[PDB]
Enzyme design. Structure first.
Site: not given
Ligand SMILES: NC(=O)c1ccc(Nc2nc(OCC3CCCCC3)c3nc[nH]c3n2)cc1
Ligand SMILES: [Mg+2]
Lengths: 294, 258
Positions: A34, A84, A125
């Site tokens: 990231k 995912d 989240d």
């Protein structure tokens, strides 16, 4: 600093930063990097994620391996996962996701969530895009940029919280204190969605969300949820919809399933099941760990 | 949510130990003193008031200052910069709306530039290895408050107030853990206001007795008695406000009768 990594392809964009798949040239290890271009200095989302991820070391929590910290750039080196849930469920298009795999992911996700909550963390989240799966049958919580360390008892924290389809009625109604129960609700919604493979409450606005939830579970009154009608964003004009028989909410689900899901989607945050307690639900008596068709 | 209260309490007490500043550090600081730290802390309090920051933010900030200073020697002219960066970090971590960097430059009467505050921020981050989620006296008290019967706003504010004083004076408070200062704080508040002691339920909870807290209780009691006379006064003023039920105006007990 980044000498040993070879970028391979861009994965996507989360709360902040950009994520790339890359491999470590000397070890072979595939990693998610990231990247945070570094105004106001280091973004609080990056400060919370790192500080919190360093503490959260659990098989079902995506693991932060390293922080390469530069003057212009900051890089988070994460363990790499293959996909995912969201990507997977759309692929599970036809098949459908088989009950044993559903139970497994759910069990694992309750595990990773239990650990967050025991370590004073709200994730805030949870949604299929943020839940990552590997080829060995593991699923893992990711993207803690929205996360926060809470105190006991909680105080008021950001109201502007949780993707709307997964957002709890207590956030929607403006309760000044929310807690771990928001993440369980998210997870309830996800459980329903692995089953039906469609989002259980796909509202386009706040009132739309509330109403969709109310149509499904009943308009809450003081009996089902003490304190509701005094909530800042509650309205006496709210239509009063009857609660549906739960078997209709996710028809494929059997008794234990419906039971578990109902406790995950209890209105009253205090009565809403904890992740810890859900682990011992009869739904899970036969839980194994199938590898998914990838 | 008592579903996790004990997992959390246990964790915070493992983490307070790993997060403890080195008790000896000022002796190893060529250019700064306990006295210059107390001035710095007392200014942070003020900043806290001026931007309506959480008390938790203040405590965190301090924690970062002690831990940073535990390995990094700093010239007196730079101490405020450490403090400014630490408060900006603590704010980013803890606050819903953190004051923007400009606001931090401003409250140093432009002693320091933006770029300076922001390279300090990067340096604290490295010295602390991004480990910012540290237990504080505040997180402990707030747990201890659950054990009141019934709750008492004055006790809470008084507890908060004394835990807060304890930030100001590295001698002696640097040798007590968050959990212990909070214990002494709460016992002292409860007694001052209501005449009760450290409840049996907190002994069961924390394993601490009066006997264990005594050492800290003695220090704190003295800090309480001497507060009107301390060189630093910002906490006293803060704690006159209606938001903390004016507890700085409550008279300390003359004895503790342990
Ligand atoms: N669908 C896909 O194509 C896919 C996805 C994710 C993926 N692998 C992976 N991704 C991450 O961030 C992905 C981001 C993207 C945007 C939402 C927040 C998460 C990670 N962070 C830490 N480990 C990670 N592993 C491989 C393939
Ligand atoms: Mg010295």
């Amino acid at each position: 600093s980044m000498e040993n990594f070879q970028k391979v392809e861009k994965i996507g964009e989360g709360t902040y930063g950009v994520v790339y798949k890359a491999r470590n040239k000397l070890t072979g290890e595939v990693v998610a990097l990231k990247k945070i271009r570094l105004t106001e200095g280091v973004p609080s989302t990056a400060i919370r994620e790192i500080s919190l991820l360093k503490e959260l070391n659990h098989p079902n929590i995506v693991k932060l391996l390293d922080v390469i910290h530069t003057e212009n750039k900051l890089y988070l080196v994460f363990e790499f996962l293959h996909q995912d849930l969201k990507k997977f469920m759309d692929a599970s298009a036809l098949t459908g996701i088989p009950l044993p795999l559903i139970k497994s992911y759910l069990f694992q996700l309750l595990q990773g969530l239990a650990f967050c909550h025991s370590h004073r963390v709200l994730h805030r989240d949870l949604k299929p895009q943020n839940l990552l799966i590997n080829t060995e049958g593991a699923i893992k919580l990711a993207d803690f940029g929205l996360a926060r360390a809470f105190g006991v008892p909680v105080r008021t924290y950001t109201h502007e919280v949780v993707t709307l389809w997964y957002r709890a009625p207590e956030i929607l109604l403006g309760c000044k204190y929310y807690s771990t129960a928001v993440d369980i609700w998210s997870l309830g919604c996800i459980f329903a969605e692995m089953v039906t493979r469609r989002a259980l409450f796909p509202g386009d606005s706040e009132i739309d969300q509330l109403f969709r939830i109310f149509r499904t579970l009943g308009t809450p009154d003081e009996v089902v949820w003490p304190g509701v009608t005094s909530m800042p964003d509650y309205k006496p004009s709210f239509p009063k919809w009857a609660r549906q028989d739960f078997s209709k909410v996710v028809p494929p689900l059997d008794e234990d399933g419906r039971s578990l899901l109902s406790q995950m989607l209890h209105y009253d945050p205090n009565k809403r099941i904890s992740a810890k307690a859900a682990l011992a639900h009869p739904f899970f008596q036969d839980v194994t760990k199938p590898v998914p068709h990838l | 949510v008592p579903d996790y209260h004990e997992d959390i309490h246990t964790y915070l007490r493992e983490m307070e130990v790993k997060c403890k500043p080195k008790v000896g550090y000022m002796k190893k600081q060529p250019d700064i003193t306990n006295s210059m730290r107390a001035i710095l802390v007392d200014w942070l309090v003020e900043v806290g008031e001026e931007y309506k920051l959480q008390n938790e933010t203040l405590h965190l900030a301090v924690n970062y200052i002690d831990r940073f200073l535990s390995s990094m020697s700093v010239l007196r002219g730079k101490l405020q910069l450490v403090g400014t960066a630490a408060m900006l970090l603590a704010s980013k971590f803890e606050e819903i709306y953190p004051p923007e960097v400009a606001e931090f430059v401003y409250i140093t009467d432009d002693t320091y530039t933006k770029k300076q505050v922001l390279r300090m921020e990067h340096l604290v981050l490295k010295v602390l290895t991004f480990d910012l989620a540290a237990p504080t006296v505040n997180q402990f008290l707030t747990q201890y408050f659950l054990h009141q019967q019934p709750a008492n706003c004055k006790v809470e504010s008084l507890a908060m107030f004394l835990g807060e004083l304890s930030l100001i004076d590295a001698d002696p408070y640097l040798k007590y853990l968050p959990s212990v200062i909070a214990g002494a704080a709460f016992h002292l508040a409860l007694y001052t206001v209501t005449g009760q002691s450290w409840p049996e339920s907190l002994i069961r909870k924390t394993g601490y007795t009066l006997e264990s807290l005594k050492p800290c209780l003695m220090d704190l009691h003295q800090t309480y008695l001497k507060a009107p006379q301390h060189a630093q006064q910002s906490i006293r003023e803060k704690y006159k406000n209606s938001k903390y039920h004016g507890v700085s105006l409550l008279n300390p007990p003359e004895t503790l009768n342990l």
